[PDB]
């Protein structure tokens, strides 16, 4: 009866229904077993990485027992759950837990062997001391109670493999993790249990997705539990979806309702400065409730001529996980990306050969034809000085997330010895820096879909292309602690400025003799860069003309640039041997100069409009 | 239990995912006929734990396979070369290499107080000597992401 007060009963529960059906495994259950039934040392311990189910057998064995596939050594033999924790709740007393757990034990040898006490978490065992969970050494290695415990694979060898005494008394039983084949079988036996519990519908081209697709994106955590995450997720958000409106239906409205409480409280601001921010508010206002009340009209020609999930559901909340864009090119996305080296021509000029291979491999990922694991892409752009290499490597990250500081850049002409490369993995266990990681790796580990760039490579010791030897091909590098970081879905950009004028065999052979083939090898097309002709300045004169305008516009202040200065100004762009930065010196030099001058001097206030024109020689505002 | 309620799926796509279930189905319903009748002879024309349960037993634990060969690994064991050029090409003075050192421990031939053949492989890039060794940890475990691999 001392039982009934520090345990719950197993069998119990599960004789009323109320435990998972469990699948497969045969192999360990009929070892359990087998174990289980012996003459003395007759206690497994499941062993293994967490997630891949090991409380799981234990049911198993548990309904198995109540039906009767089991042998006759344990037909009829009731399991109960020990619980170490409500044991040490009041003991404050010299003596009161070992009194309990001593009448516990007592109550068990009283049975005749019909119990088998469960052990969950049984690394716990150790303390409770304060001479405690020591008391049961004896009845162990004679087989008195049958221990059947679970710990994970690390734990063990933390708390319990310390101890050689107790750890003798145990029989390991090694758990790993299954295969996708049955993992989908797996999630084809549990799927009526959620069927129920969320009103819905599963598809079964639905748990085959939900388990390819997790196990190339979500690569932190182990079999089943990271498949059946998604197909609840997915339940859940449709169930959702089904009591209210649906989404993107939803999100519109919210922010509708907000942008009229602010050009509500907007409009009331005695200010003039804020008429050219109202009269911009009010605009996307009036555009967003165009599409909210085509959105309603789109939804009724539906709903009176999505009940279930699909392969679509799963992979949206794979996507809102891990941030990893893996969906269907919702006829939104694709007529954006039909158009890229457009969006990428209004800041990039020139360069047709190489804005047609960056955005060449996005395409050809986000339709699912590369290869599942390897990078994105990895290629490497070099030519002349201020030609735009390292300006397309952030018109880019601009196209793909709005943010020019959403990337991971590094500058690689710190690594100019050796040792620095201890920076970028970590440093060994028992060393100074130890408790941080490395800085690249910890960088990707936390958003793997960033975009890597490492400026000025050739300028490093040529020791660290070799530790990029592995992340290119692969996708992979592990730091200090044991955590392996994949890359199979960043796009590796290296610039660099070999050659320097070579037309395309002093260059093409100047980085075959800096670099290794097996380097080269791995590398997608070398993209050379070419030199800025005469016609293709006069507009990069336009591009910087339109910043510097966008930059004044802080005190709505303009300025007219009349032609002739506009290809004076290209004009002296000059020195082909320096690309496209004199230009923005001169720039400053000729109208910057004298604005501020004028500026700071009266003469010239705010929302003026001052115009430039081509003095004989100079520029007169 | 599978097959008898996946056929109810109101789709295309799972109908190719169905063609192939039956199969199975089918080709181990023979082989529990088969082997159900092989029970019959037996027990017309064991009763002993003898020397290589022992040995079952140390394969269970510690997954090393010490046992017995029994009749249908030493099928593979001998289209290992075959079934190794189903995935690299070439390279036959290293596949025969990497194999025989594998039939040399299943007969309990090598030495057993050394590795199970420990050799380095080394020639010009992209030949397949990195391909190989994933191509080997395949063909004993049927999971190629199975092997401890550390980059120097
Ligand atoms: N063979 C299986 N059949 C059915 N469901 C399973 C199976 N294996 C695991 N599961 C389910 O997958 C999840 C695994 O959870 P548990 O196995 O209880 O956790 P765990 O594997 O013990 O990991 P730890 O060490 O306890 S944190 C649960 O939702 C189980 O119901
Ligand atoms: N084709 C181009 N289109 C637009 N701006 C350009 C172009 N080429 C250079 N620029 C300008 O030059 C600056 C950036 O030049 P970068 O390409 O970053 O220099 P670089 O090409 O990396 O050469 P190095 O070797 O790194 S100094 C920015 O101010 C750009 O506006
Ligand atoms: N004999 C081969 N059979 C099949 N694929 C091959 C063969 N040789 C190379 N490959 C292909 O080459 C790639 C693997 O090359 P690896 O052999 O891994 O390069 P490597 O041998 O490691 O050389 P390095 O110096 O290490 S880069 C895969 O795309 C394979 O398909």
Redesign the pocket.
């Known amino acids: 009866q001392a039982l009934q007060k520090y345990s719950t009963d197993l069998t119990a529960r599960a004789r009323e229904g109320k435990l998972d059906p469990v699948i497969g495994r045969d192999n360990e259950i009929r070892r359990v077993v087998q174990v289980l039934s012996r003459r003395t040392k007759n206690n497994p311990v499941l062993i293994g990485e967490p997630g891949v189910g090991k409380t799981a057998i234990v049911e198993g064995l548990a309904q198995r027992i109540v039906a009767g596939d089991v042998p006759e050594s344990l037909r009829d033999k009731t399991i109960v759950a020990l619980d170490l924790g409500s044991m040490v709740a009041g003991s404050k007393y010299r003596g009161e837990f070992e009194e309990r757990l001593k009448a516990v034990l007592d109550d068990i040898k009283n049975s005749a062997g019909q119990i088998i006490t469960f052990i969950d978490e049984l690394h716990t065992i150790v303390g409770a001391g304060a001479d405690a969970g020591n008391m049961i050494k004896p009845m162990l290695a004679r087989g008195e109670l049958r221990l059947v415990g679970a710990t994970t694979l690390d734990e063990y060898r933390k708390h319990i493999e310390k101890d050689a005494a107790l750890e003798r008394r145990f029989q390991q039983v090694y758990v790993g993790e299954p295969s996708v084949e049955d993992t989908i079988g797996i999630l084809r036996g549990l799927k009526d249990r959620y069927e129920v519990h969320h009103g819905v519908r599963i598809t079964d081209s639905a748990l085959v997705a939900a388990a390819t697709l997790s196990d190339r994106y979500i690569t932190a955590r182990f079999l089943p539990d990271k498949a059946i995450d998604l197909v609840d997720e997915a339940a859940s958000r449709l169930r959702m979806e089904i009591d209210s409106r649906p989404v993107e239906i939803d999100e519109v409205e919210r922010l509708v309702r907000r942008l009229e409480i602010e050009e509500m409280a907007l409009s009331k601001e005695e200010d003039e400065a804020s008429a050219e921010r109202l009269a911009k508010l009010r605009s996307e206002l009036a555009d967003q409730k165009e599409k909210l009340a085509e959105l309603t009209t789109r939804w009724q020609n539906e709903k009176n001529a999505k009940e279930e999930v699909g392969p679509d559901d799963i992979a949206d909340v794979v996507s809102a996980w891990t941030g990893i864009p893996a969906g269907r090119l919702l006829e939104g996305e694709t007529a954006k990306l039909l158009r890229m080296e457009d969006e990428l021509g209004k800041r990039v000029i020139g360069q047709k050969a190489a804005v047609t291979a960056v955005s060449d491999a996005v395409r050809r990922s986000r339709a699912g034809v590369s290869d599942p694991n390897r990078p994105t892409g990895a290629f490497m752009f070099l030519g002349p000085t201020g030609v735009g290499k390292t300006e397309l490597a952030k018109a880019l990250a601009d196209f793909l997330f709005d943010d020019e500081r959403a990337m991971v850049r590094i500058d690689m002409s710190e690594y100019g010895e050796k040792h620095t490369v201890a920076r970028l993995i970590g440093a060994p266990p028992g060393y100074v820096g130890y408790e941080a990681g490395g800085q690249l790796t910890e960088a990707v580990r936390r958003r793997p879909y960033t975009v890597v760039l490492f400026d000025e490579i050739e300028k490093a010791h040529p020791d660290v292309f070799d530790v990029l030897?592995q992340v290119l091909?692969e996708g992979r590098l592990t730091d200090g602690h044991g955590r392996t970081v994949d890359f199979r879905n960043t796009i590796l950009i290296l610039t660099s400025n070999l050659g320097s004028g070579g037309s395309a065999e002093q260059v093409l052979a100047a980085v075959r003799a800096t670099f290794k083939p097996?380097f080269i090898?791995?590398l997608d097309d070398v993209l050379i860069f070419e030199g800025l002709n005469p016609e293709e300045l006069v507009r990069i004169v336009d591009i910087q003309l339109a910043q510097l305008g966008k930059r004044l516009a802080q005190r709505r202040l303009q300025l007219q640039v009349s032609l002739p200065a506009k290809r004076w100004l290209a004009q002296r762009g000059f020195d082909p041997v320096y690309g496209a930065r004199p230009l923005r010196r001169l720039v400053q030099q000729a109208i910057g100069d004298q604005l501020a001058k004028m500026l700071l001097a009266g003469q010239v206030h705010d929302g003026d409009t001052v115009p430039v024109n081509v003095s004989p020689d100079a520029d007169s505002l």
Do not use: F, M
Request: no cysteine; proline share 0%.
């Open positions: 030897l091909d097996e090898n791995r």
